[PDB]
Design a protein around this ligand. Sequence first.
Ligand SMILES: *[C@@H]1O[C@H](CO)[C@@H](O[C@@H]2O[C@H](CO)[C@@H](O[C@@H]3O[C@H](CO)[C@@H](O)[C@H](O)[C@@H]3O[C@@H]3O[C@H](CO)[C@@H](O)[C@H](O)[C@@H]3O)[C@H](O)[C@H]2NC(C)=O)[C@H](O)[C@H]1NC(C)=O
Ligand SMILES: *[C@@H]1O[C@H](CO)[C@@H](O)[C@H](O[C@@H]2O[C@H](CO)[C@@H](O)[C@H](O)[C@H]2NC(C)=O)[C@H]1NC(C)=O
Ligand SMILES: CCCCCCCCCO[C@@H]1O[C@H](CO)[C@@H](O)[C@H](O)[C@H]1O
Ligand SMILES: CCCCCCCCCO[C@@H]1O[C@H](CO)[C@@H](O)[C@H](O)[C@H]1O
Ligand SMILES: *C(=O)CCCCCCCCCCCCCCC
Lengths: 326, 11
Amino acid sequence: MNGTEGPNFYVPFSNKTGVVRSPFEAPQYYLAEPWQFSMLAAYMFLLIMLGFPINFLTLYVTVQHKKLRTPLNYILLNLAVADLFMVFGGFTTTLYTSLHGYFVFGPTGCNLEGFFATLGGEIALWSLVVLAIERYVVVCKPMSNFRFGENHAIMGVAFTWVMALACAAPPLVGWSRYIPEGMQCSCGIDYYTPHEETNNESFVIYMFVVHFIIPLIVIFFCYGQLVFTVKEAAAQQQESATTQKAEKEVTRMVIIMVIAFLICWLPYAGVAFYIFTHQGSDFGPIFMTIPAFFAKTSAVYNPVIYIMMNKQFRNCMVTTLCCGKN
Amino acid sequence: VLEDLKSCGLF
Ligand SMILES: *[C@@H]1O[C@H](CO)[C@@H](O[C@@H]2O[C@H](CO)[C@@H](O[C@@H]3O[C@H](CO)[C@@H](O)[C@H](O)[C@@H]3O[C@@H]3O[C@H](CO)[C@@H](O)[C@H](O)[C@@H]3O)[C@H](O)[C@H]2NC(C)=O)[C@H](O)[C@H]1NC(C)=O
Ligand SMILES: *[C@@H]1O[C@H](CO)[C@@H](O)[C@H](O[C@@H]2O[C@H](CO)[C@@H](O)[C@H](O)[C@H]2NC(C)=O)[C@H]1NC(C)=O
Ligand SMILES: CCCCCCCCCO[C@@H]1O[C@H](CO)[C@@H](O)[C@H](O)[C@H]1O
Ligand SMILES: CCCCCCCCCO[C@@H]1O[C@H](CO)[C@@H](O)[C@H](O)[C@H]1O
Ligand SMILES: *C(=O)CCCCCCCCCCCCCCC
């Protein structure tokens, strides 16, 4: 039957040979070779060594460069903090547990690690949505006589916190649950076992619709409007070479952002949708890690796209890293 | 439209 059930876990390995152990008690070297756990640790190490400096530096240059402290940049800082929740809530813990071959922190740690890693990922996600909305409002100007200020920026950040809690908190109180996933060294939402006692099915649907489809629709609408607005402005002002450059660059960035978003969440959405549609099927531990791979690595390529490729942040970072040199 | 784009870090 391809799996072994337990009170707070599901090991994706059959116990017909009697070798399966609780992922909170003993190494899982029967569902993956030791060297594969080492490569899990290696990748977590890579994500920490890249993810922490780039995201911490985002916060650090904002402290040193006052021009960065603008309301429109608040949500970018929110992103940086969210990624750091992924780095220390998830990546460092998984580095430690993978080197043991199982989740040594037990069920309590599983909820802790699961909550903060999910919280971090969801704040980042809704930050990308809020950013699109703010950019849409500012550039396309759907409202007359409106000026985006500090108060609007604070609401936007608070909104991401609330939406993220709307996803991360329910598994702590009975709607779905946190259990070890894949190689059983990191914990996450149970979107793949039919656990009616916590009503997993309805939560996965809620996730898919509210925390994937809706963000996708909003980001597409907002950045679609933005591209149209800039395309239209350039068309009505072809004598301006700069406006033509702007249109090219904005279109390029919008494509990069849209593609990066899909790369991050489509695997999870795809796998969840498949398991939902095809319930009663075998899913390997390495297979479950694939959507996690794409989603977690966003802690590195999102700040590259949203901070490093941002001219204001990039210049300030270069100045800071090169000791005052422009 | 350029100043709004610059304000958003888009250009
Ligand atoms: C996967 O399958 C394996 C094998 O079926 C599971 O491991 C087995 O778990 C049972 C407990 O649930 C173990 O029971 C013990 O058996 C040994 C025999 O060598 C012996 O120490 C005891 O009989 C013990 O049972 C207890 O003994 C105390 C002694 O005082 C009594 O008081 C208790 O009432 C009770 O009888 C068994 O050894 C395990 N077998 C192996 C091979 O590990 C394993 O739990 C399954 N995995 C999952 C995740 O469920
Ligand atoms: C467990 O995984 C084994 C593969 O080792 C698989 O054979 C079992 O049966 C599968 O059930 C699916 C349910 O419809 C079916 O579509 C699939 O073809 C079938 N696999 C094969 C090889 O015929 C799996 N069983 C369960 C309950 O997941
Ligand atoms: C969780 C992510 C939220 C990040 C928000 C960080 C905001 C930091 C900037 O503060 C602001 O700096 C301005 C210039 O110093 C002041 O004019 C203003 O009064 C003050 O509010
Ligand atoms: C999104 C459409 C499909 C919904 C069903 C899958 C939800 C479970 C996936 O959990 C995810 O695990 C990542 C690594 O822990 C976190 O970074 C991320 O924030 C979190 O969401
Ligand atoms: C003031 O001007 C400071 C100048 C800093 C120059 C540093 C150049 C070397 C940085 C390379 C870091 C590579 C680290 C690789 C670790 C695996």
